[PDB]
Amino acid sequence: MRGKVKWFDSKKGYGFITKDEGGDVFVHWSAIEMEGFKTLKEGQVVEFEIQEGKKGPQAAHVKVVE
């Protein structure tokens, strides 16, 4: 539901995130797609979820926190 932020790319929600006290994730642009305040400073705590399938775990829902 929340992690840390390490990298933001793409004009939408692309980049790399860090789960709470875990490791690092990835993000595509449809996980950091909000209409309030989405950007990822690359060094904060976010409010997200992650799903792992045939590939690797990526953020699907990405909000911002500190």
CATH number at residue 7: 2.40.50.140
Cα radius of gyration rounded to whole Å, the chain: 10
- Decide if 62 contacts 40 (C-beta within 8 A): yes
What letters, b where the CB count within 10 A reaches 16 and e where it falls short, cover 26-54? bbbeebbeeeeebebeeebbbebbbeeee
| 21-26-29 Cα angle (round to 5) | 130
Question: Given CA atoms 12, 41, 17, 44 in this order, what sign does their dihedral have?
Answer: negative
| Domain carrying residue 31 | 1-66
Q: Which residue spans within 1-66 are E strands per DSSP? A: 3-9, 14-19, 26-27, 45-51, 58-65
What total number of domains does the chain contain? 1
Method by which the coordinates were obtained: NMR
